[PDB]
Write a protein that binds this ligand. Structure first.
Ligand code: HEM
Ligand SMILES: O=C(N[C@@H](Cn1ccnc1)c1ccc(Cl)cc1Cl)c1ccc(-c2nnc(-c3ccc(OCC(F)(F)F)cc3F)o2)cc1
Length: 469
């Protein structure tokens, strides 16, 4: 059995330490107990295996030994809906992932760029957020809006985008309640917020299902969004088309996925850029040099030439990746190849790919946000390891890499290229339109709110904006 981490009280264990700051908690535990330990997380023994080998052990674990959906389903199933994601066996997840991956081809991503640019530009023109030549804005609130508009406009389609002008705003706010910290223990309890979650889940499904049906009734296709796509990409291995309900639920899940992860990340980008005016000027000059002084429209093709924009994202993900903790249930006992250790089935296991990304071993002056450290290498997709196809195409199991913001193994992100496209596009447009600065006498960046397993800026962070024109 791995070394149990010292705590003071029963069933609180190291929850508070972990919840306040996972990374500081993991590094301290590391210095005192090595690369493997067990801490009591809300009553559950939770074995943490750190370092690249830890990530490999947990993320490349066999389906026999490690279960994800068992740990997640109580929380996510009420939110996303039935028969998708984690409310099915792995094999079905793998196909659903394949379906979405289908929907995210170059032709799809191509079409999304001018739609995303238009949303950002129209937001900046129309929102109260940025009225005036010079001002302050709430970064997280503003960025969350921009991400929801950009993702729903491109990925979700016209009808959903348009409904965010009326009811979807309130629906998604209420559905998001499902991710309340309390639902890590009572996701099944009919507390008032969960009641609102469910009402919201139901009406959201309803509307999607109406949008789908109304498409069929016109017998037509008009764009590259994931709808027209799942309607056609309905076919499962056994010949069954994905039912309208599963499509609705998949879309809900994809909106939730993008919103949480991307909005957090884009917020951090803005906050970093505000602390680093040198870097923003570089980005601006890169756009001048690589696209021209006339600053022509952003396209899928010319974005990929924005080398520093990409590194700004990569480096931000290195320090601020939204998911800090990947947890699996141990289903059959497992042992650590190089040790006497064995992990019982009363344990969960936890990987933290964020730990290696801010380690001195792998990254010199790790806590320094410097995009230029990537001058050694850049890729929006990088893989030098062996490859495994789990059902949604070939992907690296890559964990010799200390940098895994999109995870690894069968459960790894299939949103990664869309995320880059969206973050890259938002950033490029913002870089054209603005300069950002911290508020008077504020140095550096805000604290991180570690909650709901989603990192984000803590508190209400304003930065100053000035329009270039
Ligand atoms: C910066 C942006 C993003 C980050 C950092 C991110 C991170 C991750 C990580 C770490 C995982 C693995 C989770 C695990 O092992 O349990 C993952 C899985 C996934 N992500 Fe993302 N993601 C991002 C954006 C997106 C977007 C935009 C979408 C969809 C549009 C998406 C859809 C998914 C899906 C479907 C999975 C698979 C879950 C599974 O197989 O169990 N992600 N993501
Ligand atoms: O939002 C989630 N998954 C996203 C991931 N994603 C987004 C972008 N790319 C990937 C997602 C994936 C796929 C798709 Cl299709 C859509 C989405 Cl949105 C998500 C998944 C599982 C869990 C969950 N399971 N147990 C907990 C849990 C959490 C905390 C805790 O104690 C902590 C403390 F102490 F702090 F309180 C106890 C827990 F049991 O959490 C919570 C959230």
């Amino acid at each position: 059995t791995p070394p149990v981490v010292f705590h003071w009280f029963p069933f609180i264990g190291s929850t508070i330490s972990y919840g306040i700051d996972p990374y500081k908690f993991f590094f301290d535990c590391r210095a005192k107990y090595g690369d493997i330990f067990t801490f009591i997380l809300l009553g559950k023994k939770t074995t943490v295996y750190l370092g690249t080998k830890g990530n490999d052990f947990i993320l490349n674990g066999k389906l026999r030994d490690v279960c994800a959906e068992e740990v997640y389903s109580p929380l996510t199933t009420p939110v996303f809906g039935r028969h998708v994601v984690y409310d099915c066996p792995n094999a079905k997840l793998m196909e659903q992932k394949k379906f979405v991956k289908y929907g995210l081809t170059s032709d799809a991503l191509r079409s999304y760029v001018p739609l995303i640019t238009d949303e950002v530009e129209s937001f900046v023109k129309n929102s109260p957020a940025f009225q005036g030549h010079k001002g302050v804005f709430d970064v997280c609130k503003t960025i969350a809006e921009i991400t929801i508009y950009t993702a729903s406009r491109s990925l979700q389609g016209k009808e959903v985008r348009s409904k965010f002008d009326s009811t979807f705003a309130e629906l998604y706010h209420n559905l998001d309640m499902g991710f309340a910290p309390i639902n890590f223990m009572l996701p099944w309890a009919p507390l008032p917020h969960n009641r609102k979650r469910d009402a919201a889940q139901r009406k959201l499904t309803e509307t999607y299902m109406e949008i789908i049906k109304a498409r069929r009734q016109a017998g037509s296709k008009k764009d590259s969004e994931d709808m027209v796509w799942n309607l056609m990409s309905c076919v499962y291995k056994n010949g069954t088309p994905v039912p309208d309900e599963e499509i609705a639920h998949m879309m809900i899940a994809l909106l939730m996925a993008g919103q949480h992860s991307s909005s957090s990340t884009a917020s951090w980008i803005v906050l970093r850029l505000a602390t680093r005016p040198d870097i923003m000027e570089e980005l601006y000059q890169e756009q001048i040099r690589v696209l021209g002084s006339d600053l022509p429209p952003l396209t899928y093709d010319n974005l990929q030439k924005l080398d520093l924009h990409a590194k700004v994202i990569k480096e931000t993900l290195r320090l601020h990746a939204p998911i800090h903790s990947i947890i699996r249930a141990v289903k059959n006992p497992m042992a650590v190849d190089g040790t006497s250790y064995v992990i019982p089935t009363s344990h969960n296991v936890l990987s933290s790919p964020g730990v290696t990304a801010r380690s001195e071993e792998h990254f010199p002056n790790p806590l320094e946000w410097n995009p230029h450290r990537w001058d050694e290498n850049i890729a929006a997709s990088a893989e030098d390891d062996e490859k495994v196809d789990y059902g949604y195409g070939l992907v690296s199991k890559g964990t010799n890499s200390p940098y895994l913001p999109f995870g690894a193994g069968r459960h790894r992100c299939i949103g990664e290229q869309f995320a880059y496209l969206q973050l890259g596009t938002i950033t490029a447009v913002l870089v054209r339109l603005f300069r950002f600065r911290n508020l008077p006498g504020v140095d550096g960046i805000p604290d991180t709110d570690y909650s709901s397993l989603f990192s984000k800026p803590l508190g209400r962070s304003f930065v100053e904006f000035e329009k270039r024109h």
